[PDB]
Design a protein around this ligand. Sequence first.
Ligand SMILES: CC/C(=C(\c1ccccc1)c1ccc(OCCN(C)C)cc1)c1ccccc1
Ligand SMILES: CC/C(=C(\c1ccccc1)c1ccc(OCCN(C)C)cc1)c1ccccc1
Lengths: 206, 206
Amino acid sequence: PLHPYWPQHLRLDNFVPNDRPTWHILAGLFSVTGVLVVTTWLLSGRTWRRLSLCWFAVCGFIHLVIEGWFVLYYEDLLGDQAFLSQLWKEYAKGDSRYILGDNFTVCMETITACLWGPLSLWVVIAFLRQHPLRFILQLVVSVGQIYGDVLYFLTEHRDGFQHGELGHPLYFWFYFVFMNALWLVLPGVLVLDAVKHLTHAQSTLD
Amino acid sequence: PLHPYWPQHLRLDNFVPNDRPTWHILAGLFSVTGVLVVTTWLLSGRTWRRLSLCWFAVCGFIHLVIEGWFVLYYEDLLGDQAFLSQLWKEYAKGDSRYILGDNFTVCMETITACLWGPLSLWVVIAFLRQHPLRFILQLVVSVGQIYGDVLYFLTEHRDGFQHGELGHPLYFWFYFVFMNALWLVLPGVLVLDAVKHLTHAQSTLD
Ligand SMILES: CC/C(=C(\c1ccccc1)c1ccc(OCCN(C)C)cc1)c1ccccc1
Ligand SMILES: CC/C(=C(\c1ccccc1)c1ccc(OCCN(C)C)cc1)c1ccccc1
């Protein structure tokens, strides 16, 4: 093999093995995500719901900087730019096909980065008890995230898990299954939350 | 050409020209859709929302019966089955690729048939008792439909409108653009409705 991308018949010229090791990307972003969680917990102070605000901040970050970075540079994917493009190449060492510039994958990433990022930051802004749209926004964003993620899983699945080595501990179970499963589980609860409160908002209107 | 499907280099074996003309299916759908609109206007009476409710009923039909027929009986492509198969073959004479069994198209149709249909029926049925989940469900359904439709357009666009003859009056501008623009515009207005109502329902809690 001349490259890790696992549909092994892929003829990927113009491929450059990343200079920075995988632990560079994983650790540097875990660190920046912690920084955002702390900064947003403080700005919230200025219990669980105050955590959900940091969740929505980390969302807006991933959707805008990272998932948006893919939306722009899904054609180059050569490590001469910032380590974000290398991040995406490493995620592609995981299951999916973010190297080939998949028709569907580009579209779903474009939508989540254009809408759910801004709207997630609008959730964290409008949740400081300032606007009635706080749970409507939570509901819309989390429903959209659930849709995007379920379509991502279904599409890659109906391809028979073609892209990416099946069962791989690092690349399949963590990169593919776990990271994405977050935007399946966490916003699901949030939908229920946004539903359980908005139903109450509908009941008190009497 | 041995088929109208416009990526004309498509070699489509095991293809059977529909026995029933197009007017068969057109009338068979006109009658039943009118029947549903009438029965639901009656059950609503027994102002505007009584129309929107039958809209949510007609949705429940198309998503469940028609789009469900597609989700099941691809890729047989035999007009010897019910007039649903001829319906889908005629729509595929239009732009999109409901002949090829497109990965994304099948996945999106699976989600809209499994989720948005039932949920639209839950809106129209549970909208009779003024239940508090009604504007939440209306919002969720219409947001999901908008997501499905935006991805439906975007993917074909990044495919360069490959499937289907561009600009064709019947097949592209009516079948492709208009029919989907329906589920882009009408549930958009419904999103706005449910949002302004839930904002008012959220404002009163003080
Ligand atoms: C720990 C680094 C990381 C990653 C990452 C995970 C594995 C390998 C490489 C990178 C990340 C990247 C994209 C992502 O969205 C994938 C799209 N699917 C959801 C559809 C979710 C997580 C990350 C970056 C910022 C905040 C939190 C995590
Ligand atoms: C005019 C009768 C019709 C049809 C139809 C359209 C073109 C040719 C033949 C039949 C229909 C069929 C499928 C459909 O789903 C397409 C949207 N998805 C791709 C998102 C939307 C409309 C129809 C269906 C339900 C209610 C009212 C009319």
